[PDB]
Design a protein around this ligand. Structure first.
Ligand code: 7DY
Length: 478
C-alpha cells in the first residue's frame, strides 16, 4: 500500500527500473526547477504578480510544483530510503496531487471568467477584476481544492468507512473519487463552453472591418445605397441583428418607429432593418415597410462585404440590445464611421461615450424614439468628428480585445494540454470504479500517470513560448 509503486501496476526489469528511475528523477527535478523558476520570476516582477490576468500562472506554477515536488519526494522516499507509507501519509501524498489537479482546473475557471469580463466589459473590467478581489478568488479556489483533498484524512477514506476501496488507489473510498472527478469534470465542461463562447463570439477582424476598403465620399456611398433601395436621400438608421424578444430589441425599434411615424421629422429619416427570427416581428417589420417607404427591411441573408458597405454609408447604427456579449456590431459599425445609438448594456456602456454616440435605457421605445430624434437634430450639424471619434475608439477597443483574445488562446492551449494529459487517466479511473478493470488497462493507467507530471513540465514552457511579458520579466533579473 505504498504510494507510487509502479509495481502493483506492472512488473519491471532491472533495466526498465533503471531507465525509469533515471527518466523520473531527471524529469521530476527538472519539472520542479522550471516551475520554481516560473515562480521566482513572477514574484520578482511587480508587473506580473499582481496583474489579475496573469494570476493563473502563479497559481498553475504552485500547482505544478505541488505535484512534481510530491512526485520527486515520494520517489526518493520510496526507492532510495525504503520508508513505507502509513494510511495518513499516503493520503496526504495523494491529497497533494488531487489538490494540484483541482487547483489547475480552479485556475483555468477563474482565468476564463477573467477573460470573458476583460472583453465583455473592456473598461469596467479594470474595476470588476481588481487585485484584492483576484487574490481572494484564488485563495477561496485553493482552499476549496485543499478542503476537498483532505476529506479522506478526516474520514472519507474507505478505511474509516469500511467501504469498497479502489482497485487503483490504496486507502481511499471509491465514491469519494467520483465526487472529486465529477466536480472537476463538470467544471471542465463549463470552462470549455466558456472559452469556446469567448472565442467564437469575441472580437472583430480589423483586416476586414476597415474604412480603407471603401472608395469615395460617404455621401456618394450613402446616396448610391439609398437609390439601390429606391429611397431618396435622408438620415439613415440601420438595424442589423436577430429578430427576437428580449435579446436584440427589434421589437423595441419597431415600437420606436410607430411613435415617430406620425411626426414630420420621420419623413426625413430612413430605416434599414436587417435580420431574421420570430415570424411575428418579421410580419410586423414587413408591415411597417409596406406602410412607409422610408422604412426598408431585409430578411434575405446578406453579404458581409455589403454589410461593411452599409456600416460605411449609413449615418447611425441602432443597437437596442437587452444583452450584448461582445459589442461586435457596435465595434464594426464605428470602425467604419457609423455613429451608434445603442442600449446601455454590457460593453456598450464602456464603448459608447458622449463624444462617440448615444446610449438609452434598454426595453424602452420612448427613450429610443427620442434618441433617434436627437440623432436627427445632431445630424443637422456636421458628423465628421463623430465618425472620426468613433473610428479610433473602436480601433483602440478592437486592439485591446485582440490582446485579451490572445491571452485567452494561451489558456485554451494550456487547457487542451491539460485535458490531454489527465483526460485518459480520469476516464480510466471512472472506468475503473464503474465496470471492470483489466490488467492491460491497469498498465496504460500507470503509463498515463506520467502525463500528469508531463503536463507540469510543459506548462512552464508554453508560458515561456507564448508570453513575451513572462519572457521579458525573466531577463529583468540577469
Ligand atoms: C506518476 C504517478 N503514478 C503512479 O504512482 C502509478 C499510478 C503507480 O504509476 C506509476 C508510473 C510511473 C512511476 C514512476 F516510476 F515513473 F515514477 C510511478 N508510478 C502519479 C500518481 C497519481 C496520483 C494521483 C493522481 Cl490524481 C494522478 C496520478 C503521480 C504521482 C505524483 C505526482 C504526479 C504529478 N504531477 C503524478
Amino acid at each position: 500500500e505504498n504510494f507510487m509503486d509502479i509495481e502493483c501496476f506492472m512488473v519491471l526489469n532491472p533495466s526498465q527500473q533503471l531507465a525509469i528511475a533515471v527518466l523520473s528523477l531527471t524529469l521530476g527535478t527538472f519539472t520542479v526547477l522550471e516551475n520554481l523558476l516560473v515562480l521566482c520570476v513572477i514574484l520578482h516582477s511587480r508587473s506580473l504578480r499582481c496583474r489579475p490576468s496573469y494570476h493563473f500562472i502563479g497559481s498553475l506554477a504552485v500547482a505544478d510544483l505541488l505535484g512534481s515536488v510530491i512526485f520527486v519526494y515520494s520517489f526518493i522516499d520510496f526507492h532510495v530510503f525504503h520508508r513505507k507509507d502509513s494510511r495518513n501519509v499516503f493520503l496526504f501524498k495523494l491529497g497533494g496531487v488531487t489538490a494540484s489537479f483541482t487547483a489547475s482546473v480552479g485556475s483555468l475557471f477563474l482565468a476564463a471568467i477573467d477573460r470573458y469580463i476583460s472583453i465583455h466589459r473592456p473598461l469596467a473590467y479594470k474595476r470588476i477584476v481588481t487585485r484584492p478581489k483576484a487574490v481572494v478568488a484564488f485563495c477561496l479556489m485553493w482552499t476549496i481544492a485543499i478542503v476537498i483533498a483532505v476529506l479522506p484524512l478526516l474520514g472519507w477514506n474507505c478505511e474509516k468507512l469500511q467501504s469498497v476501496c479502489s482497485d487503483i488507489f490504496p486507502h481511499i473510498d471509491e465514491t469519494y473519487l467520483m465526487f472529486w472527478i465529477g466536480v472537476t469534470s463538470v467544471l471542465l465542461l463549463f470552462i470549455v463552453y466558456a472559452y469556446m463562447y469567448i472565442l467564437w463570439k469575441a472580437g472583430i477582424d480589423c483586416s476586414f472591418w476597415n474604412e480603407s476598403y471603401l472608395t469615395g465620399s460617404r455621401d456618394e456611398r450613402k446616396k448610391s445605397l439609398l437609390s439601390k433601395f429606391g429611397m431618396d436621400e435622408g438620415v439613415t438608421f440601420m438595424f442589423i441583428g436577430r429578430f427576437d424578444r428580449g435579446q436584440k430589441g427589434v421589437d423595441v425599434l419597431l415600437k420606436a418607429i410607430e411613435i415617430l411615424s406620425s411626426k414630420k421629422e420621420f419623413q426625413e429619416m430612413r430605416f434599414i432593418i436587417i435580420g431574421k427570427g420570430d415570424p411575428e416581428l418579421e410580419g410586423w417589420a414587413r408591415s411597417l415597410e409596406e406602410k412607409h417607404g422610408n422604412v426598408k427591411v431585409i430578411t434575405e441573408m446578406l453579404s458581409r462585404e455589403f454589410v461593411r458597405e452599409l456600416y460605411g454609408s449609413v449615418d447611425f447604427v441602432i443597437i437596442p440590445s437587452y444583452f450584448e456579449p461582445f459589442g461586435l456590431v457596435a465595434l464594426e459599425a464605428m470602425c467604419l464611421g457609423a455613429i451608434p445609438i445603442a442600449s446601455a448594456v454590457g460593453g456598450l456602456r464602456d464603448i459608447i461615450t458622449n463624444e462617440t454616440g448615444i446610449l438609452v435605457k434598454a426595453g424602452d421605445p420612448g427613450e429610443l424614439a427620442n434618441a433617434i430624434l436627437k440623432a436627427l437634430e445632431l445630424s443637422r450639424s456636421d458628423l465628421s468628428k463623430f465618425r472620426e471619434n468613433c473610428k479610433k475608439r473602436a480601433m483602440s477597443f478592437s486592439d485591446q480585445a485582440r490582446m485579451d483574445i490572445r491571452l485567452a488562446k494561451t489558456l485554451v492551449l494550456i487547457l487542451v494540454v491539460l485535458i490531454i494529459c489527465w483526460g485518459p487517466l480520469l476516464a480510466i479511473m471512472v472506468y475503473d470504479v464503474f465496470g471492470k478493470m483489466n490488467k492491460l488497462i491497469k498498465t496504460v493507467f500507470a503509463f498515463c500517470s506520467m502525463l500528469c507530471l508531463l503536463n507540469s513540465t510543459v506548462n512552464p514552457i508554453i508560458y515561456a513560448l507564448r508570453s513575451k511579458d513572462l519572457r521579458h520579466a525573466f531577463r529583468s533579473m540577469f
